[PDB]
Amino acid sequence: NNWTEFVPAVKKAFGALGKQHPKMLAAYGALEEASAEGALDAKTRELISIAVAITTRCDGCIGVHTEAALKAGASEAEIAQTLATAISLNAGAAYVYSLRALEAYDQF
Template sequence: MLQNWTETLANNRKAGEALGKHNPQLLTAFRALNQAQGATGTLDAKTRELIALAVAVTTRCDGCIAAHADAARKAGVTEAELSEALATAIALNAGAAYVYSLRAMDALSAGQA
């Protein structure tokens, strides 16, 4: 195991208490945002968690991975389903690197007529 994800999730929740103590409105708004996602019922919980994990990987958020892996497990996500979602995240990151490489090339040549 690369990391103790259960511990990461618990540590983040405990650390969040201090932030909530000093910024209760921020914490309330953050919780409301998380509760609001999926409120329409258009996507099922499994699909939302697969998307959340793919986004968590692309944004490199360990806390997000811990929280959404826990929720994905509860929603019944399989390793095969997660693997396919993560393949999309990997491809997207490669695509983003390609597009930003084009931007870097453009920036280097800027001003050269």
């Protein structure tokens, strides 16, 4: 459809990248191996990925790790709660720098 058609195309672009520049795809594979090492469970790692995917505003990253979260057995409330946490942290960053603006106003 929209995401069910986008994700295979994104995975294909990564495959064409490895056939042309294998050291670049091997660099990402090294990043995924470092992430996979440790007792974290695949679903929790994918949920961590979705929270970062929506923060970086990467549509290809969203669909890849959302489909991987479902394959890992993540329910709908687990994802919505993960997104709600990422929204709170994205808003928390603006709260911190807004706090710096208020502190500057009182100081001048």
